Short mmCIF file of C-alpha atoms in Angstrom, two decimals:
data_model
loop_
_atom_site.label_atom_id
_atom_site.label_comp_id
_atom_site.label_asym_id
_atom_site.label_seq_id
_atom_site.Cartn_x
_atom_site.Cartn_y
_atom_site.Cartn_z
CA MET A 1 8.45 5.32 -17.35
CA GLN A 2 6.84 1.89 -17.11
CA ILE A 3 3.28 1.14 -16.09
CA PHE A 4 1.15 -2.01 -16.22
CA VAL A 5 -2.33 -2.57 -17.60
CA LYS A 6 -4.56 -5.51 -16.73
CA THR A 7 -6.80 -6.03 -19.74
CA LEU A 8 -10.43 -7.16 -19.63
CA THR A 9 -9.29 -10.61 -20.77
CA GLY A 10 -7.10 -10.66 -17.66
CA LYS A 11 -3.75 -10.19 -19.40
CA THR A 12 -1.13 -8.05 -17.66
CA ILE A 13 0.89 -5.99 -20.14
CA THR A 14 3.64 -3.39 -19.84
CA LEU A 15 3.42 0.05 -21.39
CA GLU A 16 5.99 2.82 -21.79
CA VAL A 17 4.47 6.20 -20.89
CA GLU A 18 5.28 9.70 -19.67
CA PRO A 19 3.70 11.46 -16.65
CA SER A 20 2.44 14.13 -19.05
CA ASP A 21 0.72 11.59 -21.31
CA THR A 22 -3.02 12.15 -21.59
CA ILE A 23 -5.41 9.27 -21.00
CA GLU A 24 -6.11 9.32 -24.75
CA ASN A 25 -2.39 8.95 -25.50
CA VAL A 26 -2.40 5.95 -23.16
CA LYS A 27 -5.48 4.41 -24.82
CA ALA A 28 -3.73 4.78 -28.18
CA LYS A 29 -0.67 2.93 -26.84
CA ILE A 30 -2.91 0.08 -25.71
CA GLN A 31 -4.37 0.01 -29.20
CA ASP A 32 -0.89 -0.13 -30.75
CA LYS A 33 0.07 -3.00 -28.49
CA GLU A 34 -3.11 -5.09 -28.06
CA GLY A 35 -5.39 -3.99 -30.89
CA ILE A 36 -8.08 -2.72 -28.49
CA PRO A 37 -9.75 0.40 -30.01
CA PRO A 38 -9.51 3.51 -27.79
CA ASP A 39 -13.25 4.23 -27.86
CA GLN A 40 -14.16 0.99 -26.12
CA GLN A 41 -11.62 1.42 -23.33
CA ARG A 42 -12.38 2.45 -19.79
CA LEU A 43 -9.14 2.92 -17.87
CA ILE A 44 -9.40 2.62 -14.11
CA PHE A 45 -6.96 3.42 -11.33
CA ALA A 46 -7.58 3.65 -7.59
CA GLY A 47 -11.23 2.81 -8.21
CA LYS A 48 -11.59 5.80 -10.53
CA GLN A 49 -12.33 5.94 -14.24
CA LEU A 50 -9.69 8.22 -15.80
CA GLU A 51 -10.74 11.12 -18.06
CA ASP A 52 -9.54 11.56 -21.65
CA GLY A 53 -8.25 15.13 -21.40
CA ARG A 54 -6.41 14.67 -18.11
CA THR A 55 -2.91 13.28 -17.58
CA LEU A 56 -1.35 10.41 -15.65
CA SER A 57 0.32 12.92 -13.32
CA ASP A 58 -3.03 14.47 -12.42
CA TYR A 59 -4.05 11.08 -10.98
CA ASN A 60 -0.72 10.66 -9.19
CA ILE A 61 -0.03 7.59 -11.29
CA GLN A 62 3.67 6.86 -10.71
CA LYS A 63 6.01 4.39 -12.39
CA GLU A 64 4.99 0.75 -11.94
CA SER A 65 1.34 1.63 -11.23
CA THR A 66 -1.20 -0.86 -12.61
CA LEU A 67 -4.26 0.37 -14.47
CA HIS A 68 -7.28 -1.83 -15.04
CA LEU A 69 -8.93 -1.92 -18.44
CA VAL A 70 -12.65 -2.61 -18.73
CA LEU A 71 -14.47 -2.42 -22.05
CA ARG A 72 -17.68 -0.72 -23.05
CA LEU A 73 -19.80 -3.50 -24.53
CA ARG A 74 -22.88 -2.97 -26.70
CA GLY A 75 -25.12 -4.89 -29.10
CA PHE B 1 -16.86 -24.72 -10.40
CA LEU B 2 -19.38 -21.89 -10.56
CA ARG B 3 -18.76 -21.21 -6.86
CA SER B 4 -15.03 -20.83 -7.54
CA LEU B 5 -15.31 -17.63 -9.58
CA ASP B 6 -12.72 -14.99 -8.70
CA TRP B 7 -14.30 -11.53 -9.06
CA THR B 8 -12.10 -8.44 -8.80
CA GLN B 9 -13.81 -5.19 -7.77
CA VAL B 10 -12.58 -2.58 -10.24
CA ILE B 11 -14.89 0.32 -9.62
CA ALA B 12 -17.95 0.92 -7.41
CA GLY B 13 -20.46 -1.86 -8.06
CA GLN B 14 -18.56 -3.48 -10.96
CA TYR B 15 -16.46 -6.67 -10.94
CA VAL B 16 -14.47 -8.52 -13.57
CA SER B 17 -13.66 -12.23 -13.74
CA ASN B 18 -11.54 -14.34 -16.09
CA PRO B 19 -12.66 -17.99 -15.71
CA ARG B 20 -12.09 -20.55 -18.43
CA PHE B 21 -15.08 -22.66 -19.43
CA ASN B 22 -17.50 -23.72 -22.18
CA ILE B 23 -20.68 -21.63 -21.91
CA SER B 24 -22.75 -24.66 -23.00
CA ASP B 25 -21.34 -26.82 -20.21
CA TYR B 26 -23.07 -24.70 -17.58
CA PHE B 27 -25.77 -22.69 -19.37
CA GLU B 28 -28.63 -23.01 -21.79
CA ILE B 29 -28.47 -20.18 -24.31
CA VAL B 30 -31.80 -18.57 -25.09
CA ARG B 31 -31.30 -16.85 -28.43
CA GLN B 32 -32.87 -13.40 -28.80
CA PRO B 33 -34.07 -11.56 -31.96
CA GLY B 34 -31.39 -10.09 -34.22
CA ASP B 35 -32.97 -6.65 -34.14
CA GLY B 36 -31.44 -3.72 -32.28
CA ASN B 37 -33.18 -4.63 -29.03
CA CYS B 38 -31.44 -7.93 -28.19
CA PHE B 39 -30.02 -6.50 -24.94
CA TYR B 40 -33.44 -5.61 -23.63
CA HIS B 41 -34.90 -8.82 -25.02
CA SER B 42 -32.29 -10.71 -23.01
CA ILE B 43 -33.00 -8.88 -19.74
CA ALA B 44 -36.77 -9.36 -20.29
CA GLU B 45 -36.30 -13.08 -20.97
CA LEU B 46 -34.73 -13.54 -17.53
CA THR B 47 -36.82 -11.13 -15.46
CA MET B 48 -40.36 -11.11 -16.93
CA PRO B 49 -43.00 -13.88 -16.83
CA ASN B 50 -44.82 -14.76 -20.05
CA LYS B 51 -42.19 -12.83 -21.97
CA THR B 52 -42.76 -11.95 -25.63
CA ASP B 53 -41.00 -10.12 -28.43
CA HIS B 54 -42.66 -6.95 -27.06
CA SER B 55 -41.71 -7.34 -23.39
CA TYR B 56 -38.45 -5.40 -23.88
CA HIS B 57 -40.30 -2.07 -23.98
CA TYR B 58 -40.65 -2.40 -20.21
CA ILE B 59 -36.94 -2.91 -19.60
CA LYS B 60 -36.35 0.25 -21.64
CA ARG B 61 -38.83 2.10 -19.42
CA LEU B 62 -36.93 0.91 -16.34
CA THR B 63 -33.74 2.01 -18.10
CA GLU B 64 -35.18 5.51 -18.58
CA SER B 65 -36.24 5.67 -14.93
CA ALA B 66 -32.80 4.37 -13.92
CA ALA B 67 -30.88 6.93 -15.96
CA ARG B 68 -32.79 9.85 -14.41
CA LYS B 69 -31.41 8.79 -11.02
CA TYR B 70 -28.02 7.34 -11.97
CA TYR B 71 -26.88 8.56 -15.38
CA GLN B 72 -25.02 11.68 -14.27
CA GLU B 73 -23.00 9.66 -11.74
CA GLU B 74 -22.35 6.67 -14.06
CA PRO B 75 -18.64 6.47 -14.93
CA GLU B 76 -19.50 4.86 -18.28
CA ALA B 77 -21.74 7.81 -19.18
CA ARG B 78 -18.52 9.81 -19.67
CA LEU B 79 -17.90 7.78 -22.83
CA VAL B 80 -21.37 8.79 -23.96
CA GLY B 81 -20.81 12.42 -23.00
CA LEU B 82 -24.42 13.28 -23.82
CA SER B 83 -26.61 15.17 -21.39
CA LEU B 84 -29.31 13.17 -19.62
CA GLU B 85 -31.95 14.45 -22.06
CA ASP B 86 -30.15 13.71 -25.34
CA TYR B 87 -29.08 10.28 -24.07
CA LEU B 88 -32.68 9.35 -23.24
CA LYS B 89 -33.96 10.39 -26.67
CA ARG B 90 -31.31 8.17 -28.24
CA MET B 91 -31.67 5.26 -25.80
CA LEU B 92 -35.44 5.17 -26.25
CA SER B 93 -35.04 5.31 -30.03
CA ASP B 94 -36.35 2.40 -32.11
CA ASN B 95 -33.87 -0.49 -32.40
CA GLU B 96 -31.09 1.26 -30.49
CA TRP B 97 -28.30 -0.85 -28.95
CA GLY B 98 -28.19 -1.48 -25.21
CA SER B 99 -24.84 -1.86 -23.44
CA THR B 100 -22.83 -2.14 -20.20
CA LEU B 101 -23.97 1.41 -19.43
CA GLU B 102 -27.61 0.36 -19.29
CA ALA B 103 -26.64 -2.86 -17.50
CA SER B 104 -24.97 -0.87 -14.72
CA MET B 105 -28.00 1.43 -14.32
CA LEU B 106 -30.59 -1.36 -14.54
CA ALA B 107 -28.76 -3.46 -11.94
CA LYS B 108 -29.36 -0.66 -9.40
CA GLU B 109 -32.84 0.26 -10.61
CA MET B 110 -34.12 -3.34 -10.59
CA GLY B 111 -32.10 -4.26 -7.52
CA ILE B 112 -30.48 -7.17 -9.36
CA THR B 113 -27.04 -8.31 -10.39
CA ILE B 114 -26.37 -8.52 -14.11
CA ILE B 115 -23.46 -10.52 -15.48
CA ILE B 116 -22.22 -10.14 -19.01
CA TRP B 117 -20.18 -13.00 -20.44
CA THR B 118 -18.32 -11.76 -23.49
CA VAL B 119 -17.07 -14.59 -25.74
CA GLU B 120 -15.41 -19.78 -25.05
CA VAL B 121 -15.52 -17.16 -22.29
CA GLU B 122 -13.02 -14.29 -22.57
CA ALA B 123 -14.18 -12.55 -19.38
CA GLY B 124 -17.21 -11.72 -17.27
CA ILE B 125 -18.29 -8.27 -16.14
CA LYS B 126 -20.60 -8.15 -13.12
CA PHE B 127 -22.86 -5.21 -12.28
CA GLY B 128 -24.19 -5.68 -8.78
CA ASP B 129 -22.90 -7.43 -5.68
CA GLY B 130 -24.69 -10.76 -6.09
CA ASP B 131 -23.26 -14.05 -7.33
CA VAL B 132 -23.78 -15.89 -10.61
CA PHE B 133 -26.48 -18.19 -9.18
CA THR B 134 -28.81 -15.27 -8.42
CA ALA B 135 -27.68 -13.08 -11.29
CA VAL B 136 -29.22 -12.24 -14.65
CA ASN B 137 -26.62 -13.81 -16.97
CA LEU B 138 -26.13 -12.44 -20.52
CA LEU B 139 -24.03 -13.72 -23.45
CA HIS B 140 -22.21 -11.04 -25.46
CA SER B 141 -20.97 -12.30 -28.86
CA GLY B 142 -19.68 -10.80 -32.11
CA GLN B 143 -19.11 -7.59 -30.16
CA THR B 144 -22.58 -6.83 -31.50
CA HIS B 145 -25.07 -9.18 -29.86
CA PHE B 146 -26.69 -10.24 -26.57
CA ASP B 147 -28.52 -13.47 -25.73
CA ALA B 148 -29.90 -14.74 -22.42
CA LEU B 149 -28.25 -17.47 -20.33
CA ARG B 150 -29.90 -19.81 -17.84
CA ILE B 151 -27.87 -22.03 -15.55
CA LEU B 152 -28.51 -25.65 -16.48
CA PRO B 153 -30.77 -27.35 -13.87
CA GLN B 154 -28.11 -29.84 -12.74
CA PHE B 155 -25.96 -26.93 -11.59
CA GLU B 156 -28.85 -25.05 -9.97
#
């Protein structure tokens, strides 16, 4: 199924996922597609940061839902 | 132009914006030491009078105090995963990197807004509900470094 991700840089991308995909599987797909390393990613939906072990279905994230990506920034 | 910023609330207390501008057109950049404390140096530069290369110790103290009240509830702490005690030991460590985690906690502890401009600007991340004119503005570059920003007088 298709979902959307709005990156930190403001870019809206499409991603092909399954309901049973874990958040980590989804981070990895963002890496494959945009080069953003999974350990910097904070995925947000419905004002909630999503947790690595859980799945899209747990958060009732249905097809065509839009996640927001914010990055952990350090230096 | 600075009034035109479009901030999207993503999660409690945190906003993102994607304006397009030259940092130098609107800000003076106050470079901070290339040690591991640049984040705290930057905060100190913008918050503390008669600031020195040692002033950052105080920001780190406020960060400790902030974590004790906010760390367990901080969404970004989940990427740390550490308990409150192990995180503190590491945070307080010599030359340790600050980050958006500390920024979020400090914003609440100091009662300020902190804006982090990650670079030409790629995006801004705002911690706090204030606007850029009242905010503590930081410049994040190289994915490894923070400097302080001050709005140029003509735009103040």
